[PDB]
Design a binder for this molecule. Structure first.
Ligand SMILES: CC(=O)N[C@@H]1[C@@H](O)[C@H](O)[C@@H](CO)O[C@H]1O
Ligand SMILES: *[C@@H]1O[C@H](CO)[C@@H](O)[C@H](O)[C@H]1NC(C)=O
Ligand SMILES: *[C@@H]1O[C@H](CO)[C@@H](O)[C@H](O)[C@H]1NC(C)=O
Ligand SMILES: *P(=O)(O)Oc1ccccc1C
Ligand SMILES: [Cl-]
Length: 527
């Protein structure tokens, strides 16, 4: 039997055999009072002590959320869908520790993406047993509230102050601080890592004074707070909270009464109205996400970044070669996962309307002008490739690069990667390339399991990535020192060196998407 005593009480785990070894999993440990009843939309309350033991032997409830129903039965989309019961009672976390119990282990804390609207820690691609086994780090991941239940904002008013889901994450980092030493973890060596909204979450913890002392280093996969989908303004969070109230018939005059009304609704009624709090949406709509609450976030984060107001430490940042492709089949005319999606100039233009609904005629045209000046000729996939690049560059790549330059300008070592490998098992079609979210299985070490139909070259690549991530967490330096590897250089501004990740040749390059990103971060914010 394997029992650990934590501040709030005893917890029992279970033994897992991985790679001829053993890993101890503590799945579903509670870290806050369930935010039910009068607690909905509030910050998370600390947990009530318990006698007896807590059986942490299965993944807990996932947080209430709408599910992707565009491709029922298709693994490509359903692998991201929640794999545990949905419930408002969902504030739990997981711990994987190597066996035997480590002495002073570096800790990796995972934060999932999901556009702040979806996600759960219990996904197969976030299984931390491989990392614990192979690198002897301890892996932690938590569930946190998403959508309106987690980001509904009536700013000021503590009944629904905004950013609750970010505070869920923060209370969990706190739990690691007070508890991880009992699991053989080193609270002084904690690395946050996350992807998409997870990565943008990590970036926000870098700015939040309440998070400063709760971690050491940070890894941001395909995401940062300066991404255009990442932070809702005070003015439009307001319109959204109100619109949600009208739709749900909770429009009151006393703001606190509106919240009280919203508290006596079935989550389904709130989930089903979330999508219409906006006049026109995009496949990348974040209807309820982070705001400037004056608490977790004390000012507009672009200002804090620009002015050096963040945790001074090392960061590891990167993106995938075809970030934008994933989103083209959730709306763009002429696009399908089931054919090669050769679209026309008119389908491209219509495609911008989908992705940039609120921008001017001139704005959509400026994008067209920048991305359609090509050569030879008359290449049928021109418009197809270009639209994917538009969405990728604007939503992910350029803000990640920009974040990194700005962060590095204040003295800290930063490391940038460009993930170029399309998985051998990718269920999506070839034209969609190296998709958003498909580096994760490599980071978490799935290809190490050689019964899982990955090629050997993928096993090797994953092993190197796992080693780089682990060395970054342990030592702030994402090198692989033992197997004649390419050194990964710091990303300085001006020089802007980055490292390519692929199965064949690993290369140092400079100035990723220079021309494109010049268009986005300099010209485009003016339109
Ligand atoms: C951490 C890492 O990448 N270690 C590799 C290992 O996987 C491989 O067996 C060996 C072959 O010489 O090269 C080294
Ligand atoms: C673990 O490591 C830290 C250094 O980061 C040290 O301060 C702490 O005392 C160590 N605790 C032990 C002995 O496990
Ligand atoms: C609104 O109602 C709440 C709950 O009864 C009360 O606490 C608050 O003081 C009221 N505020 C206003 C502006 O009437
Ligand atoms: P992530 O996979 O969470 O991608 C989304 C989805 C919806 C909205 C925004 C974003 C970044
Ligand atoms: Cl509080």
């Amino acid at each position: 039997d394997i029992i650990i005593a934590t501040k709030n009480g005893k917890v029992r785990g279970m033994q897992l055999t991985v790679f001829g070894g053993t890993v101890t999993a503590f799945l579903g440990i509670p870290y806050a009072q369930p935010p039910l009843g009068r607690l909905r939309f509030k910050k998370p309350q600390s947990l009530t002590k318990w006698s007896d033991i807590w059986n942490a032997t299965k993944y807990a409830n996932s947080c209430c959320q709408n599910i992707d129903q565009s491709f029922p039965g298709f693994h490509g989309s359903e692998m991201w869908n929640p794999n545990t019961d949905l419930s408002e009672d969902c504030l739990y976390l997981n711990v994987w520790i190597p066996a035997p119990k480590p002495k002073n282990a570096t800790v990796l804390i995972w934060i999932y993406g999901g556009g702040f609207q979806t996600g759960t820690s219990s996904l197969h691609v976030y299984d931390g047993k491989f990392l614990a086994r192979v690198e002897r780090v301890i892996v932690v991941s938590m569930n946190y509230r998403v959508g309106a239940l987690g980001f509904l904002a009536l700013p000021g008013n503590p009944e629904a102050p905004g950013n609750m889901g970010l505070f869920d994450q923060q209370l969990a980092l706190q739990w690691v601080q007070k508890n991880i030493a009992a699991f053989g973890g080193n609270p002084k060596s904690v690395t946050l890592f996350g992807e998409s909204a997870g990565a943008a979450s990590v970036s926000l913890h870098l700015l939040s004074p309440g998070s400063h002392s709760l971690f050491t280093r940070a890894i941001l996969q395909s995401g940062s707070f300066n991404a255009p989908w990442a932070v809702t303004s005070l003015y439009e969070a307001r319109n959204r909270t109100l619109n949600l109230a009208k739709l749900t018939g909770c429009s009151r005059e006393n703001e606190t009464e509106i919240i009280k009304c919203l508290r006596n609704k079935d989550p389904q009624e709130i989930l089903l109205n979330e999508a219409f709090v906006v006049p026109y949406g995009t496949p990348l709509s974040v209807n309820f996400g982070p705001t400037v609450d004056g608490d977790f976030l004390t000012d507009m984060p672009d200002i804090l970044l620009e002015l050096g107001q963040f945790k001074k430490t090392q960061i590891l940042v990167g993106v995938n070669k075809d970030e934008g492709t994933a989103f083209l089949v959730y709306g763009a005319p002429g696009f399908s996962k089931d054919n090669n999606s050769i679209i026309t100039r008119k389908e491209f233009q219509e495609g911008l309307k989908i992705f940039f609904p609120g921008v001017s005629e001139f704005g959509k045209e400026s994008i067209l002008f920048h991305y359609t000046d090509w050569v030879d000729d008359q290449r049928p996939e021109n418009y197809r490739e270009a639209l994917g690049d538009v969405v990728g560059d604007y939503n992910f790549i350029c803000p990640a690069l920009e974040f990194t330059k700005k962060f590095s300008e204040w003295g800290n070592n930063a490391f940038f990667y460009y993930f170029e490998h399309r998985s051998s098992k990718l269920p999506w079609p070839e034209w969609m390339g190296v998709m958003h979210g498909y580096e994760i299985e490599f980071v978490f070490g799935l290809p190490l399991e050689r019964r899982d139909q990955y090629t050997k070259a993928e096993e090797i690549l994953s092993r190197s990535i796992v080693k780089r991530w682990a060395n970054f967490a342990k030592y702030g330096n994402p090198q692989e020192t033992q197997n004649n590897s390419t050194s990964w250089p710091v990303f300085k501004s001006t020089e802007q060196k980055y490292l390519t990740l692929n199965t064949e040749s690993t290369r140092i390059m400079t100035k990723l998407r220079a021309q494109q990103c010049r268009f986005w971060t300099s010209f485009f914010p003016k339109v």
